[PDB]
Design a protein around this ligand. Structure first.
Ligand SMILES: *[C@@H]1O[C@H](CO)[C@@H](O[C@@H]2O[C@H](CO)[C@@H](O)[C@H](O)[C@H]2NC(C)=O)[C@H](O)[C@H]1NC(C)=O
Ligand SMILES: *[C@@H]1O[C@H](CO)[C@@H](O[C@@H]2O[C@H](CO)[C@@H](O)[C@H](O)[C@H]2NC(C)=O)[C@H](O)[C@H]1NC(C)=O
Ligand SMILES: *[C@@H]1O[C@H](CO)[C@@H](O)[C@H](O)[C@H]1NC(C)=O
Ligand SMILES: *[C@@H]1O[C@H](CO)[C@@H](O)[C@H](O)[C@H]1NC(C)=O
Ligand SMILES: *[C@H]1O[C@H](CO)[C@H](O)[C@H](O)[C@H]1NC(C)=O
Ligand SMILES: *[C@H]1O[C@H](CO)[C@H](O)[C@H](O)[C@H]1NC(C)=O
Ligand SMILES: *[C@H]1O[C@H](CO)[C@H](O)[C@H](O)[C@H]1NC(C)=O
Ligand SMILES: *[C@H]1O[C@H](CO)[C@H](O)[C@H](O)[C@H]1NC(C)=O
Ligand SMILES: [Ca+2]
Ligand SMILES: [Ca+2]
Ligand SMILES: [Ca+2]
Ligand SMILES: [Ca+2]
Ligand SMILES: [Ca+2]
Ligand SMILES: [Ca+2]
Ligand SMILES: [Ca+2]
Ligand SMILES: [Ca+2]
Ligand SMILES: [Ca+2]
Ligand SMILES: [Ca+2]
Ligand SMILES: [Ca+2]
Ligand SMILES: [Ca+2]
Ligand SMILES: [Ca+2]
Ligand SMILES: [Ca+2]
Ligand SMILES: [Ca+2]
Ligand SMILES: [Ca+2]
Lengths: 71, 423, 423, 5
């Protein structure tokens, strides 16, 4: 199989963007059999105050009261 | 070593449990399905210790009690509290027994009224009130009276591990717990149990772990009794059959002149057919004298005091005076006494598998080389066909002292090839 | 007993005895119709069906009364059904979601128990043994087996298969039977996949789909014949055509009230449902495992069930671009108030034509009383609107528009070839 | 082919 592609357990070659896309592109579980990387990070205009688990619209940052429990 | 998913201490005697077995502090591994179910199986309660049963969760297929134990699912609603907490019998909607003809037990069990105090506990209820044993007020000998209910139960089940009486007489602290059984009995170590003195040291295992037979037992297995004859094989027989003319001991120990059979003079009025030889008994009971059966080796018991026989034209007439059918001729058996049947015969040869002896006798092939003169002339015990020459153990094969000769590359290789390092 | 089979146009029930021909059950039919999966509930005289034109699963009495839907939400090409008559669980196979689902009929409770298949087709479940079998026909084709709870998935037949369309079970012998349509064969084996055997060549079988075993006959449906054929279940058999010209033909099934008899620990009496909330599943070797719907997790006791929103969050009936019907179905948001019943409950055509509930751009709106009608009904010479708005002031101008010189022209301005006149 | 039409 070419270095561009993952070699599936059934002998298919599949492009290594589609591995871990969430769908079994190999038709075997091979390209989803080892795909853990999904962190709790918050996208968009939210902010994740460090060491705290909530995510808040960045307009509230320095609004003049601590949104998150401690500084 | 750290047993049981590295959570537990066990003494490191080198041996290990299997993959699916739990380990106890004292060893004696137990299967995982016995873990945390009210049954003590380790002896120390390691399989039921509160620490072990704290994190343990029931297998998907087992009923979980409110207590946290894991009973097999078929125990649920079976009348009988096996959960301890009764949590598997809680909510059970039992059918109402026909009280007009059946008895509804205190545990909800249905049983016929005819079975009330019939002789044995049927309800097994916490109340125990079926087997009151209603009609008699007592139990006679060859049984113990059970204590609060008068069932006839042999003491032989005292302390044995289940309530034979349904009343605790077989578990009474009055006996077995106090002092060691009646004068006619002994106590097993496993289970803790009174048993008869004729089980204790009797030649067999009668407790669960054989503690009734603990190596020191009389003289020997052939200790027998003052009324029983003693056999070299360890068998015990009645003294009445000693030197009666046939093997009773099972090893001929009662049928030899080696110990004593020289004066085997039999009982009372038995006819003594002196024509008989050690292959048969000379003395014959008068019970079957003149009965038409050849008791003696030459059937003299059928002429000595017997009415004459008219015989038949369709039967073989022995020249001596006996009468038999044609089936009793040419068969190596002296049916007529005077060998008139076997005389002048032309026995056809032995079968394909059948072995032939020098005297022409036919014997089964299995009966060759077994230290018994089955051919009569000793053909089946001839050295040439019976002796097995030991292997030559040539070059490439070292004869070590054990006889199991090994490959000559292995000589004093420090690996025990021949029993106690004979190489 | 009777033979139940499905087709594009109807679901029918037929006597096994070919001597008579009349139905025993009312046909099941609709205006749009493409029936595929079927099964029956003998204890309620009820059958189930799917319809790929509506993506609903239905239930209906044999008499025809009491039609109800089971589900209409997230069904995609339901290619087969099977019913666990002891647990009252309905299993189906979404060829479009590529999964198998189970649903309890007592209260609507569903989970995708197997999720990542390729082209699953027939499914069959055996309640007393606690196994379910399903076929997959993607290139590396195979027949799976799993515990009824949807675990221990493993292939039992993966060698010498292509297109293994229909599974069925001989209840009298605990033998699985299956069609294969790439090698044009029918085979059978024990439930373990061992002891595999092949029936002889069947005349004019070319592509079979449905399979059933009842008494000593095997019933099969061939797409290339468009018929139901019968053979003896032990060998090639006497191919006997049961039906012919049956259009697009789908699964067969043997209705039998005697079959739907028995009890696992999942519905023994004195307690209900094997103590599980929501589901219990029979598991091989006479045991039960509890189950929980989507979004719920088994508690520490492994039987009672608790909310689990952390792992499986609650979900909407429909997306943001689709209108959720009163029925569980889902339709495009612009199919609301289009004059056509798309939800199969008239839920999309309810209280239409009012402010906050306007007619679609495609439909024609009656000017008064809030009624939206299909566009095709606008000025077609039928008074559809309650106020007759649809047959008022529309073009009469046929104009100088003419059909080609080849075509004859009617007074209705429809045109047909001159060849068609006076036939 | 073998797909449901
Ligand atoms: C086809 O099915 C067979 C079973 O009939 C599979 O063989 C088993 O393979 C597993 C490992 O995957 C072993 O532990 C078993 O012992 C095998 N046999 C049994 C008794 O099940 C085989 O792996 C399957 N092949 C494919 C391609 O899936
Ligand atoms: C859309 O219009 C209809 C009719 O004007 C509204 O219908 C009422 O809705 C409420 C709440 O669901 C019901 O209790 C009433 O019975 C409905 N009918 C009447 C006659 O009151 C509906 O509320 C409108 N929707 C929106 C979002 O404005
Ligand atoms: C109970 O037994 C009586 C006497 O035989 C009988 O008449 C009656 O029908 C029985 N009832 C039930 C519920 O079993
Ligand atoms: C019934 O059960 C109780 C425990 O709940 C026990 O103490 C009692 O001894 C039992 N009854 C009889 C008759 O033994
Ligand atoms: C006990 O339950 C836990 C979950 O709470 C696990 O499923 C565990 O495997 C179960 N016990 C056993 C022995 O399987
Ligand atoms: C939402 O979808 C999930 C699966 O993604 C479940 O089917 C769940 O039951 C759905 N919720 C509703 C209300 O139908
Ligand atoms: C009113 O509702 C319908 C529902 O099909 C359409 O969305 C329509 O576009 C809406 N409004 C108007 C003014 O057309
Ligand atoms: C009728 O319409 C056709 C198609 O457009 C032609 O235009 C034809 O010439 C028309 N006939 C007349 C008489 O105008
Ligand atoms: Ca992928
Ligand atoms: Ca702030
Ligand atoms: Ca235990
Ligand atoms: Ca119980
Ligand atoms: Ca009794
Ligand atoms: Ca006892
Ligand atoms: Ca003994
Ligand atoms: Ca003797
Ligand atoms: Ca005699
Ligand atoms: Ca003779
Ligand atoms: Ca011999
Ligand atoms: Ca050696
Ligand atoms: Ca074909
Ligand atoms: Ca619509
Ligand atoms: Ca109209
Ligand atoms: Ca015409």
């Amino acid at each position: 199989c070419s270095p561009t592609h993952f070699l599936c357990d059934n002998g298919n070659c599949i492009y290594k963007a589609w591995i871990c896309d969430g769908d079994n592109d190999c038709r075997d579980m091979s390209d989803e059999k080892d795909c853990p990387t999904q962190p709790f990070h918050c996208p968009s205009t939210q902010w994740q105050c460090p060491g705290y688990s909530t995510c808040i619209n960045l307009s509230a940052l320095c609004d003049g009261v601590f949104d998150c429990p401690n500084g | 070593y750290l047993a049981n998913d590295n959570k537990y201490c066990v003494v490191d005697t080198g041996t290990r449990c299997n993959q699916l077995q739990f380990t106890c502090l004292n060893g004696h591994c137990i299967n995982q399905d016995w873990k945390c179910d009210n049954d003590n199986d380790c002896g120390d309660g390691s399989d039921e210790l509160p620490t072990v049963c704290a994190f343990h969760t029931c297998r998907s297929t087992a009923f979980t009690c409110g207590n946290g134990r894991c009973v097999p699912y078929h125990y649920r609603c079976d009348y009988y509290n096996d959960c301890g907490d009764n949590s598997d019998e809680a909510g059970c909607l039992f059918r109402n027994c026909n009280s007009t003809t059946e008895f509804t037990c205190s545990n909800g069990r249905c049983i016929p009224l005819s079975y009330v105090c019939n002789g044995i506990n049927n309800c097994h209820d916490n109340d125990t009130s079926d087997e009151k044993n209603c009609p008699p007020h007592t139990c006679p000998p060859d049984f113990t009276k059970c204590q609060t209910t008068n069932i006839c139960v042999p003491r032989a089940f005292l302390c044995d591990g289940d309530n034979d009486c349904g009343d605790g007489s077989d578990e009474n602290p009055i006996y077995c717990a106090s002092h060691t059984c009646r004068s006619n009995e002994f106590q097993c170590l496993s289970p803790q149990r009174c048993i008869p003195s004729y089980w204790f040291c009797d030649g067999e295992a009668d407790c669960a772990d054989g503690s009734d037979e603990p190596d020191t037992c009389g003289h020997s297995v052939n200790t027998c009794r003052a009324s029983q004859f003693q056999c070299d094989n360890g068998r015990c027989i009645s003294g009445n059959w000693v030197c009666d003319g046939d093997n009773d001991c099972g090893d001929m120990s009662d049928e030899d002149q080696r110990h004593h059979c020289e004066l085997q003079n039999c009982s009372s009025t038995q006819f003594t057919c002196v024509n008989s030889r050690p292959p048969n008994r000379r003395c014959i009971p008068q019970y079957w004298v003149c009965d038409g059966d050849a008791d003696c080796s030459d059937a003299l018991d059928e002429l000595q005091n017997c009415t004459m026989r008219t015989c038949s034209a369709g039967e073989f007439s022995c020249a001596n005076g006996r009468c038999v059918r044609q089936s009793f001729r040419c068969d190596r058996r002296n049916d007529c006494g005077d060998y008139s049947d076997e005389r002048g015969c032309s026995y056809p040869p032995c079968h394909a598998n059948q072995f032939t002896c020098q005297n022409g006798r036919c014997i089964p092939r299995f009966f060759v080389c077994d230290e018994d003169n089955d051919c009569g002339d000793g053909s089946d015990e001839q050295e040439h066909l019976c002796h097995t020459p030991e292997p030559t153990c040539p070059l490439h094969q070292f004869r070590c002292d054990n006889g199991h000769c090994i490959e000559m590359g292995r000589v004093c290789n420090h690996v025990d090839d021949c029993s106690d390092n004979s190489d | 007993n009777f033979l139940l089979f499905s087709s594009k146009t109807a679901v029918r029930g037929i006597p096994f005895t070919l001597s008579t021909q009349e139905d025993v059950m009312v046909p099941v039919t609709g205006s749009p119709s493409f029936f595929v999966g079927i099964d029956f509930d003998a204890q309620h005289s009820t059958v189930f069906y799917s319809d790929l034109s509506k993506d609903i699963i239905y239930k209906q009495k044999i008499d025809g009364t009491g039609k109800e839907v089971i589900t209409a939400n997230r069904l995609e090409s339901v290619e087969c059904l099977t019913f666990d008559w002891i647990s009252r669980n309905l299993y189906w196979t979404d060829g479009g979601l590529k999964s198998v689902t189970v649903l309890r009929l007592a209260d609507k409770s569903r989970r995708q128990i197997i999720s990542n298949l390729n082209n699953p087709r027939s499914i069959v479940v055996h309640p007393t043994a606690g196994y379910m079998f399903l076929s997959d026909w993607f290139r590396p084709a195979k027949i799976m087996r799993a515990w009824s709870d949807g675990s221990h998935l493993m292939p039992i037949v993966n060698t010498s298969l292509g297109w293994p369309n229909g599974l069925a079970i001989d209840w009298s012998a605990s033998r699985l039977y299956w069609v294969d349509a790439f090698f044009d064969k029918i085979e059978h084996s024990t439930l373990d996949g061992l002891d595999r055997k092949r029936l002889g060549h069947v005349d004019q079988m070319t592509h079979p789909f449905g399979l059933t075993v009842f008494k000593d006959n095997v019933f099969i449906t061939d797409w290339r014949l468009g018929a139901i054929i019968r053979v003896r279940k032990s060998d090639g058999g006497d191919m006997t055509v049961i039906r012919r010209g049956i259009s697009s033909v789908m699964h067969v099934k043997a209705y039998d009230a005697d079959l739907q008899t028995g009890s696992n620990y999942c519905s023994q009496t004195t307690h209900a449902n094997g103590d599980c909330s929501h589901f219990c599943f029979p598991v091989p070797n006479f045991q039960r495992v509890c189950g929980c719907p989507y979004g719920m997790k088994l508690q520490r006791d492994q039987m009672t069930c608790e909310g689990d929103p952390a792992r499986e969050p609650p979900t909407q009936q429909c997306g943001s671009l689709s209108f959720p019907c009163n029925n569980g179905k889902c339709v495009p948001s612009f199919f609301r108030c289009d004059g056509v019943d798309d939800c199969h409950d008239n839920s999309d055509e309810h209280q239409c034509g009012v402010f906050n509930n306007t007619c679609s751009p495609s439909a024609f709106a009656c000017v008064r009383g809030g009624q939206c009608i299909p566009g095709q009904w606008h000025c077609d010479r039928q008074n559809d609107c309650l106020d007759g708005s649809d047959e008022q002031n529309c073009p009469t101008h046929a104009t100088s528009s003419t059909c080609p010189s080849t075509s004859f022209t009617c007074d209705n301005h429809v045109c047909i070839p001159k060849d068609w006149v006076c036939d | 082919x073998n797909x449901x039409x």
